[PDB]
Amino acid sequence: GSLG
Amino acid sequence: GSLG
Amino acid sequence: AMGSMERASLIQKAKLAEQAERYEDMAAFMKGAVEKGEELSCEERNLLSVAYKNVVGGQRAAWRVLSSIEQCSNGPEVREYREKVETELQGVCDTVLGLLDSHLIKEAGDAESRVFYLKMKGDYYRYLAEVATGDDKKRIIDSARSAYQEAMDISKKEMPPTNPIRLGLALNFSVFHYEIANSPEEAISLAKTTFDEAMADLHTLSEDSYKDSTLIMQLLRDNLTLWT
Amino acid sequence: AMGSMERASLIQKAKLAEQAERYEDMAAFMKGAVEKGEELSCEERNLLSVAYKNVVGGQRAAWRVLSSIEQCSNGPEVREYREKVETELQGVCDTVLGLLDSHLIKEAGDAESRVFYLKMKGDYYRYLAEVATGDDKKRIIDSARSAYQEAMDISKKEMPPTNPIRLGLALNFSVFHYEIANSPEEAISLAKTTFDEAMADLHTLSEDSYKDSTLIMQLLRDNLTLWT
Ligand SMILES: [Ca+2]
Ligand SMILES: [Ca+2]
Ligand SMILES: [Cl-]
Ligand SMILES: [Cl-]
Ligand SMILES: [Mg+2]
Ligand SMILES: [Mg+2]
Ligand SMILES: [Mg+2]
Ligand SMILES: [Mg+2]
Secondary structure (H helix, E strand, C coil): CCCC | CCCC | CCCCCCHHHHHHHHHHHCCCCCCHHHHHHHHHHHEEEEECCCHHHHHHHHHHHHHHHHHHHHHHHHHHHHHHHHCCHHHHHHHHHHHHHHHHHHHHHHHHHHHHHHHCCCCCEEEEEEHHHHHHHHHHHHHHHHHHHHHHHHHHHHHHHHHHHEEEEECCCHHHHHHHHHHHHHHHHHHHCCCHHEEEHHHHHHHHHHHHHHHHHCHHHHHHHHHHHHHHHHHHHHCC | CCCCCCCCHHHHHHHHHHHHCCHHEEEEEEEHHHCCCCCHHHHHHHHHHHHHHHHHHHHHHHHHHHHHHHHHHHCCCHHHHHHHHHHHHHHHHHEEEEEEEHHHHHHHCHHHHHHHHHHHHHHHHHHHHHHCHHHHHHHHHHHHHHHHHHHHHHHHHCCCCCHHHHHHHHHHHHHHHHHHCCHHHHHHHHHHHHHHHHHHHHHHCHHHHHHHHHHHHHHHHHHHHHHH
16 A cells, blocks of 8 residues: 555 | 477 | 776666566665765755655565465464565665665755655655564654654744645655554645645646646545545 | 475475465476486476466566667666566576476476486477577577477377467467567468368367367467568
8 A cells, every 4th residue: 555 | 489 | 896887887877677677786876976975965855755665565465475375374484584674675775764864964054955854764764663663663663753753843934734745745744643653634634735725736837847736635535545 | 495395295385385476486386396216296297387487477577678678779887787687588598498407307208207307308499498598599499490390399299280289389389489580481381281280180189178179179279460
């Protein structure tokens, strides 16, 4: 679910 | 175009 | 190691390695560039982050496969090879943390650089925490939280709520809360406040800035959908 | 290097590395297994081939990206980094060729093992030829052709026309003709004869053997569509  |  | 290669040549080769999807090479070129001792431009910080994101992303996905297999099993081989992959992952995190501590963060005075590097420090301690066990796990979690908090404090004072750096920091700190810190309510509150604050600021943006910000807002929304 | 690890543990770890998509690790585990000196079973030969296929496949795709960029450009960096990737590719091919010469091929007496290893020898010389220039290129091409021809001669004498080993050898030798040896007619003739001979033999097969053979026949057909 994090960035990228 | 080869195998795999 | 890359000590004999020109900084500009290291940057050029990092961009070639990105085009070739050779992310271990790209990371080694960017480590060499950092170790030249000069501060990194915006473009160069992004090259550094992309390189190591991809390298550790591979290691994380492999570690997850191996840990799943090891858990199912619970001879020594699965444990041995999960430990080998784990050690190599920890090494990559220790390398990135080392570049930030020597001496990227201390030289970074502008908000865009300082927030970027402190978010990175949070993210790489967060990957350490994903594989850590016990008390050790506590001190690493607290390192991640501290880094993310310092970055949040500067971003809220220095950048607009739609700034993509600020939005990506909030996205990752929200994931830290939900996945590492066992604080799903803090995760949802952060992601919701961050989304609503950016929504309200969108009217200020050009068409291209609007696309950059809304892209990351959609990631906050996708998490909120998953978590609620 | 893997000298202290049990053969069976190397095989087990190669299968774990395949599950984790860690193909460099899988190849190193399988190199260790080969260097134990014992012949490889069918399953183990497939592990060896998959590991190095994936490793060199990555290197080949990267080399193609870099060579394309270098050609467009025609400082030293693109050439330097294409040469680094090229050298590492040649190293991986030399390693596989070395395992086949010391001593896989000479111990392989059954047609399934001997054809498999000689096809591999053809394929890794073929990857060497893809990056080779000039006269050097000639001797490497001839090594590939010789290996493929010996494998074809044994397969035609010892295996049915639908045998997947035999069909995959013919597929790759046909690609060798079209892409390396500048012999597109030989490529089309080989692929067409191989397809028609297998078609005629399908009636002999079980449902599962039929699926294995028709899968490779479709690859010959896809090439024939591309080439005609
Ligand atoms: Ca191991
Ligand atoms: Ca280079
Ligand atoms: Cl690395
Ligand atoms: Cl390798
Ligand atoms: Mg200089
Ligand atoms: Mg609640
Ligand atoms: Mg033993
Ligand atoms: Mg003709």
